[PDB]
Amino acid sequence: GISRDSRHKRSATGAKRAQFRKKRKFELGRQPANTKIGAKRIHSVRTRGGNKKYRALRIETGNFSWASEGISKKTRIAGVVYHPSNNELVRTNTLTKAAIVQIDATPFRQWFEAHYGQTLGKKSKNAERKWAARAASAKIESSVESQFSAGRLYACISSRPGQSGRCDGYILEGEELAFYLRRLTAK
Amino acid sequence: PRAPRTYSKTYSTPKRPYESSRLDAELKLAGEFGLKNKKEIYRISFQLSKIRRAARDLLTRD
Amino acid sequence: ELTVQSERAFQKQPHIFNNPKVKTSKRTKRWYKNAGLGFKTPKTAIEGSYIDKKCPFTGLVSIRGKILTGTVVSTKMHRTIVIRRAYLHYIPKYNRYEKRHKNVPVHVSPAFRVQVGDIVTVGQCRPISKTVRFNVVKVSAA
Amino acid sequence: ARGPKKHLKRLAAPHHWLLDKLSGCYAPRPSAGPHKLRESLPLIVFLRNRLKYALNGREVKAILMQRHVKVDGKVRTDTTYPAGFMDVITLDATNENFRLVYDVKGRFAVHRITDEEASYKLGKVKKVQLGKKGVPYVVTHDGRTIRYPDPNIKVNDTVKIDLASGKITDFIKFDAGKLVYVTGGRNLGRIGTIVHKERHDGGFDLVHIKDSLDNTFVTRLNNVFVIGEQGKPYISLPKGKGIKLSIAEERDRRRAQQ
RNA sequence: UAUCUGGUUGAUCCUGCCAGUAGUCAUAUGCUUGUCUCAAAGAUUAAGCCAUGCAUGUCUAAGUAUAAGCAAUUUAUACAGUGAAACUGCGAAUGGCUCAUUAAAUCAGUUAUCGUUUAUUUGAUAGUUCCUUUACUACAUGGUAUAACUGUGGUAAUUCUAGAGCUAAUACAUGCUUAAAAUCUCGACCCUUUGGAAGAGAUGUAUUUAUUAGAUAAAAAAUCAAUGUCUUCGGACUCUUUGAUGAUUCAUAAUAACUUUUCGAAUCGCAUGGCCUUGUGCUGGCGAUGGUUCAUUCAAAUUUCUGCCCUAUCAACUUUCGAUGGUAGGAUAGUGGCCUACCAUGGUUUCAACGGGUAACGGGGAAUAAGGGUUCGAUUCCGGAGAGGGAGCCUGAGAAACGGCUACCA
RNA sequence: GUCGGAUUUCCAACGGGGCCUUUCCUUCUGGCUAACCUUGAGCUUGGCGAACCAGGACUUUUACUUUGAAAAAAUUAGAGUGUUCAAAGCAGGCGUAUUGCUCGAAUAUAUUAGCAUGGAAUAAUAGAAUAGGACG
RNA sequence: ACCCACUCGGCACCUUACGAGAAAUCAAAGUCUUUGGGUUCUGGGGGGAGUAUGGUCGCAAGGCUGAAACUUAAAGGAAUUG
RNA sequence: GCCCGUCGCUAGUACCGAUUGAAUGGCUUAGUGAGGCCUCAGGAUCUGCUUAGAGAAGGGGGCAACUCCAUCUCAGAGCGGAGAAUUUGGACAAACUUGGUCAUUUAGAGGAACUAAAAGUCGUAACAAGGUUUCCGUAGGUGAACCUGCGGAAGGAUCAUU
RNA sequence: AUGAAA
C-alpha cells in the first residue's frame, strides 16, 4: 500500500536511505476519493481504532452556511467552476476542500422573503412587525444581489468530504468574493 | 531468561612464575601450615591483596 | 512581498470572519497570539496585512520544546532560511575539542526581514516540512 | 512490538518491590489501573513478599477470589491489581488495615492502622478541567475523577475523601510552609516542609524543601506530594518519618537496638 | 599490584623487532579425570534444507444446551445438577528463536504531541429515542435465520464440503415507554399603533460546517439612530460575569442546520423483601455482562539537541519521473513532499557531503589496566529487524501477522 | 566549668555576606508598605515596592566552571548476613517457643549531550567617528 | 681610504660543556621523565617495493599518489680493540 | 675475509594475459506483468412490501340468478434489501527478460618477477686508495655483475699554503 | 684473478 513515511524517500543531504523495514499499517495511505455529483453513494472504511470514515462519492446535496446570519441550509450542487489546486479537478467536476461551486440560492431566497419581506432580483400583524424590526439590513451588496437575481450562488466547500462524507461550505461574501470573481473573469 | 549467576574466582596466579625465593617461601608456608595447593596460598595472598588495596585507597583520604 | 494574495487560493486566517455588512472602525480584523517564554509579538506582525499561517505569532503553529540560537547563512528560499550552529565537540582521549556545525533549517515569518549574518533564536514547533522543525522569534544584528 | 506488552520480566520490574533474582525468570506485571507500572505495588508481591501471609501465587489468587481482601472499600478480586501510593487495604481477618505509603529507604512500606484511618485517605490532584454540560471537575493521582469541587482547589492541591462515596471530607491548598512527602528520585520517602520554590517558566517547576534536621534539598513539583500543615501530619507516618540519616548513624541505631 | 628478561657483537652502547611472561564469561583440540555446589552449550562457516512428534486455546452461580450424554429433580412442568459438540465473547499482535538487513538508520541520554490512536483495567458519566410527533406502533417485550444435531451423501487424499429438515442468543437486523422550567419562530385574536396576544414545533448524546463568548494596564466629558433598566421620562444608572495555560481558533457554553443516523440495556445469576387502592397490582437488594463521552492506566506512532568503525586507488552529491522550499488539495488517527497540481531553484560539502567496505543490530556491559587507554559486546536485560526472498491484504483496539491468508521466485 | 566528652569573652587565621571610597549593582503600577522618619509614659496612630509575589520594561553573545533535579535493573565498588567455610544468595536473628517479637534487603558510580544554577579570571565576542549617538 | 670604541643584520670560526645525545659530536643537535611556546611534513624491524594495480601529467623518457600475497631474525647506527 | 649479478636445477607466492572470460550479490533504464486492495458496472441467486385478475371450495346475505371476504393456483406490474461469478479504470507492485553500473571471489596457453633452499657454472662489481675513490640523477652500450658521457655530493683517500 | 658447508 501507499506509504506515508520518509524512509522511502531520499535524505536531505542527497543520500538514498537503505531498505530498513517492511511497510506498516501505521504509515499507510489509501486512494483518493474523487467525489462526484448525483446519486449519493457513501462507502465507509475501517480505520485505526474503529473510528469510522465516511468516504464521500457521488454526493448530490450538501450543507452551506451564510455567516453574517449564522444560518445553514441544505442544497444541491451544480458543479465546481474553480479550484486553485487543479484545473483537472475543475474539468472532471470533483469536490474537495476550498472548492468553488454553484448552488440554487432558492432556500435562502424564500427564507429572505419570509424573514425580511424584501424582494430580490428584478400581511399579519406579527410578521409585519418582525419585518419592520429586521429592516435596514436588506442592503447586502450588488454582487450578491445579482447572484440572487441569477439563482446560482457562489459557495466554497470547506469540509473534507473524503474524510467526512460531507460537502459543507459557505456562501462567498465581500473581499474573497471579489477575489474569486476576479479569478473567474480573468481573461 | 533466568538472571545469570555471578561467578568470580578467589585467587590470582603470580605475574612472574619462576622466582626461587617466592617458590621457596610459599613452599615453606604450605609445608608448615599443612596445605596442598599453591592455589590456596594464592587465595590467601589474594585476600591480603584485596584488603591492602582497600587500606591504601582508604588511608589515602583525610 | 508585493501582493499578500499572490497565490491562486485566498490566504487568510481561518474562522476570523470580518463581517462585510457592518462598517465599523478598523475595517479588517487580525488574529494573533503571544508565543510565551518572554517573547514579543512585533508591531509589524500586529499591523501586518500578510497571512503566513506557519508563523508562530499570527499563524497557528505552537512553539514548544527546545530553543536554540544561531547565525543565518542562507536567505535564498521562500519564507525559509538555514542557520549555522557553530559549536565544539569534546574528545576525552586527547582531552580537547574540535569545531563542528550542524546546518539546521528553520522557518521564518514575514514579521522579520533578515539578511545574512543576522544572529537569530528560534523555537521548536511541529514539522513544518521534511527538513524544518523550528521557527524564529528574535533577531540580534543589523 | 505489534501491540501492548503483556508479560513482564524480572530486572525490568522495578527495584523497590525487592523481588529476588532467583526463583523463576518472570515477574508480576501490574495490569492497568489507577497507578503506573513502575511506581506501583501489586497485591501478589504484597501478600507474598511483605507479610508472608501466603506462600504461592495460587494461594494468593485463592484469597483474592474468596474475597478476604478489599481495597478502597471494594473487593478488587484481581491477582495483579496496582496498590499504589497512599492507598488503603482492609482485612476483615485479624481486623487489620495496612496502608501503602513509602519509606525513607525508597520502598513501599507496610503501615499498620485502624478502620477510620483506612476510611479516609489522601490524594493529590493531578489536574483540573471543565467536563461536559458545564460541570467543573478535577482528577487526582489515583485515577479518581471528582465533580463540582471548590474553586479554592487548584492544581498541586490535595483532597481527603469519604471512601464510601467519592465526595470530599476536606482539602489542602499549595503554598509556602506546608508539610509534604516526596515521590520520585533519590528523595523517595522524605518529609520536608516547603520553604520556597522557583518557576523556570517553560517546564520543570522546582521546589526548595527541608526536613526538621535543618537538612535541605530541591525536588520537582510533580514529584512532591503535600500532606498537610507544619507539625501535625494528616495521617500516621512510618518508621523514620523521612529523615535519611547516614549509613553510619543507621549502623549505630541498629547496633544499639541489637 | 607504575616491575621485566633472552637474541645482531670478539666484546660495548643504541635504535629496532622477534621471542619469553601474565590474563580473557575467548573458542577449538590433545592427555587425564574421584567428590560437593553453581552452569554456558549449532552464534562465528550455511538467516542452508528439514522427516516425525509437541509448542494457544478457553467458562463461571451468572451469553446460547431437548447431546435421542450421564446422575438424580421430586425445592420445583420450562428447564432449572453435571455436561461432550457447536454458535457467541475474548485471546492467538504477548511469550519464544536468531542477528540476516541497517553506518544519522536502529540505538543511548534528553524533549514534545498546543500534532495523534489507545482494546483492556480504574473513577465519574445517557428524565429529553412515539418522527402528518391522534391510532402512524406489543413494551408484563417484537422478527429472521444458522450452527450443533437428524439423515442422503460425493472424492484416492485435505481441519475437503454440497443437498434436505429443525431449533437457540449479549448472534444478526429492528424497536416505544418519566418531571419541571427557558428562548425562538410563527401566530390565532384584540387590532393597537407604547402596541399587547391564547395556542403549536423544537431543544439529550454523537458527526460535519459556519458564527459569538471564552476577558480584564487608568480617570472623566458632548450628544443622540431610538429615552433601555425605573421614573421627579428632571434622568440616578450604578448593578455587571467567564476556568486553566509559558502561550491557542484550549477546555467549555450557545445560536443554524447537517447524518445515508451514532449511543441512550428487548441481557443474565442468586436472594426473594415490603405497601395496600387484596391486583401474579405497585415497589426492593447483592451482583455479572455490555454501553456514548471525558479522565486514568498498559501502550503506540512521529519528534527536538548530541554522539558511530575503516575509506579521497571515492570530490563533488541530490534534482529527468521530488531533490530544497512555498500555496492549495487528497490521504492519514494525526503534522509534514507522505502524495498530487502550480510556482521559486534550491538543499549537503575539506568542520570528509555523496559513493564503497564491514567476519556492523545498537545499548546496559565484558576482558584489561597507576593515570591516559586499547580490544570485544551474536549471546539471559532494554529498544530494533525478520520467519526461505519480496510484494499485498482480511479479521481485529493492536499485524503488513507468517505455528493467517493471496500471488510470483527458488 | 563532663571524669578521655563539650562550652563560653575568646585574642588569630581561614574562607563567606553587606556598606562607603566619583562604583545604578533595570524601575513603574501595586498591595507587605519594608527595613515603618512612624513613640503613646518606656512596646505607639503615618517612612522610600520586591526582602513575598503578578505583570510594562531593557533582558549584546558564547566557551568555561560550581551546585542541583534526572540518568531501569542486573553488572562494578561496597554495608549486614555463618549457604557447615567459600563461590553464592538476600536471607535471617530473638522469645515465656502455646498467644509470638523484630533490624533488614543500604550506600556509592553514572561519560558526552540537554534543563536550572552562583561566579566573572581566562579565551574570543559587537558597541557612538562623511555620530541616522544616550540620557530629555 | 685607514685606526679605536660602540651598534644592528649577515657567512662562518676558536675554546669550553652548565646542558644534550647511544656515540661521533652540537650555540643548538641546549632550555626534554623537573616531560606542554605555535604549526606543517614524514618514520613504526629487514626485504618484497617505490614493485603491481587504479587514477593523473607528459611527444616520449618517465614523474606524483601507491599497496598486498610471500619470506626472514636480524638488517642498521656510533664507537672500542685486533 | 666478506660479497654482487646473469645463467642452470627444485618448490612456493603474486602480477600481465587472448579468452567480446566465468560466477555471486546489490542498485537499475526499458518491456511483459501475476496477486490482492480501492472505484465504474454487472447480476445469477435468495428475500420483504404493495396491489394484481381468475379456475372455484367455505360460511354470511336477494336465499334463485346474484352479492362480501378469506382462500391451493398462476401470470402481470411496480416499491425495495442482501447479493457471489465476471468486469472498466486506478494505485501498490512480487516475478521474469534485456541492457547499464557497483562491489566480492575465480579459471587460463604463455611472458616476466620475487622469495627460499649445505656445499652448481661464468666472472670479481663492492668493502683497504678493493687494485680505474665511491655514490646520486640522466642517457646510451653490453652475457653478467657492470662501463662510459654530463652535472652533483663526501657517506673521501684532503677540514690545511699569509 | 679466485679460495666450498658447519
**Could you write out the DSSP letters of every residue in chain C?**
---TT-SSS----TT----SS---SSSS-------STT----HHHHH-----TTSSSSSS----S---EEEEEEEEETTEEEEE--EEEEETTTTEEEEE----EEE--TT----TT-EEEEEE-S--SSS--EEEEEE---
Q: Is the dihedral of CA D19, D25, D31, D37 positive or negative?
A: positive
Q: How far, in Å, CA of A93 to CA of A87, rounded?
A: 9
Same-domain pairing of D157 and D178? no
Residue D250 lies in a domain: no
**Residue ranges making up the domain that contains C16:** 1-142
Same-domain pairing of D80 and D133? no
Within 13 Å, how many C-alpha atoms sit on residue D252's CB side?
5
Residue D257 lies in a domain: no
Q: Find the Cα–Cα–Cα–Cα dihedral D197, D201, D203, D204, rounded to 10°.
A: -10
**Burial (CB count within 10 angstroms: exposed 0-12, middle 13-18, buried 19+), residue C83:** buried
| Segments of A26-145 assigned E as strands | 41-47, 50-57, 61-66, 71-76, 80-82, 99-103
A5 shares contact with chain C (CB less than 8 Å): no
H or E element in which residue D216 lies: strand D216-220
Q: Find the Cα–Cα–Cα–Cα dihedral A138, A142, A144, A147, rounded to 10°.
A: 120
Q: Which residue is nearest to nucleotide H37 (CA to C1')?
A: A1
Asked if D100 and D41 touch (Cβ cutoff 8 Å), the reply is yes
Q: How far, in Å, CA of A2 to CA of C52, rounded?
A: 30
Strands D69-71 and D82-83: unpaired
In angstroms, this model's resolution equals 3.9
Same-domain pairing of D205 and D185? yes
Same-domain pairing of D98 and D134? no
B2 shares contact with chain D (CB less than 8 Å): yes
- What is the three-class DSSP state of D255? helix
Q: How far, in Å, CA of D133 to CA of D118, rounded?
A: 34
In this structure, what are the phi and psi dihedrals at residue A110, rounded to the nearest 5 degrees? -65, -35
C-alpha cell at D253: 541505631
Q: How far, in Å, CA of D16 to CA of A21, rounded?
A: 38
Q: How far, in Å, CA of C20 to CA of B55, rounded?
A: 90
Give D21's contacts (C-beta < 8 A, 6+ positions apart): B3, D10, D11
Q: Which long-range contacts (CB under 8 A, 24 or more apart) does A120-129 make?
A: A120/A145, A120/A148, A120/A149, A121/A145, A121/A148, A121/A149, A121/A150, A122/A149
Percent helix / strand / coil, chain D, rounded to 5: 15, 25, 60
What single DSSP character describes residue A121?
-
Same-domain pairing of D24 and D88? yes
- What is the three-class DSSP state of A87? helix
Residue type, A158: S
Same-domain pairing of D68 and D9? yes
Could you list the protein residues whose CB lies below 7 A from any atom in strand H? A 1-2, 19, 30-31, 34, 41, 43, 45, 55, 57-58
Q: Which residue has the cell 478476604?
A: D68
Same-domain pairing of D93 and D7? yes
Give D12's contacts (C-beta < 8 A, 6+ positions apart): D27
Q: How far, in Å, CA of A101 to CA of A103, rounded?
A: 7
Same-domain pairing of D148 and D161? yes
**Residue ranges making up the domain that contains D199:** 174-244
Instruction: Kindly list the residues from chain D whose CB atom is less than 8 angstroms away from the CB atom of residue B3.
Output: 10-11, 21-22, 25
Same-domain pairing of D25 and D84? yes
Residue D82 lies in a domain: yes
Residue D249 lies in a domain: no
Cα Rg of chain A (Å, integer): 22
D22 shares contact with chain B (CB less than 8 Å): yes
Same-domain pairing of D112 and D125? no
C-alpha cell at C124: 521548536
Residue D258 lies in a domain: no
- Paired residues of D90 in beta bridges: D70, D97
Same-domain pairing of D125 and D94? no
Chain F nucleotides close to protein (CB under 7 A) are 52-54, 57-64, 68-80, 86-91, 103-108, 111-117
- What is the three-class DSSP state of A185? helix
Give A139's contacts (C-beta < 8 A, 6+ positions apart): none
Residue D65 lies in a domain: yes
Residue D92 lies in a domain: yes
H or E element in which residue D171 lies: strand D168-172
Residue D31 lies in a domain: yes
Residues 74-133 of chain C: which lie with beta carbon within 7 Å of strand F? 87-90, 92, 119
Same-domain pairing of D222 and D138? no
C-alpha cell at A58: 457521488
Asked if A166 and A56 touch (Cβ cutoff 8 Å), the reply is yes
What single DSSP character describes residue A120?
-
The DSSP result for B1-62, as a single string, is: -PPPPP---S----SS---HHHHHHHHHHHHHHT-S-HHHHHHHHHHHHHHHHHHHHHHT--
Total of domains in chain C: 1
Q: How far, in Å, CA of A48 to CA of A165, rounded?
A: 18
Total of domains in chain D: 3
C-alpha cell at C74: 542562507
The three-point CA angle D34-D35-D38 to 5° equals: 160
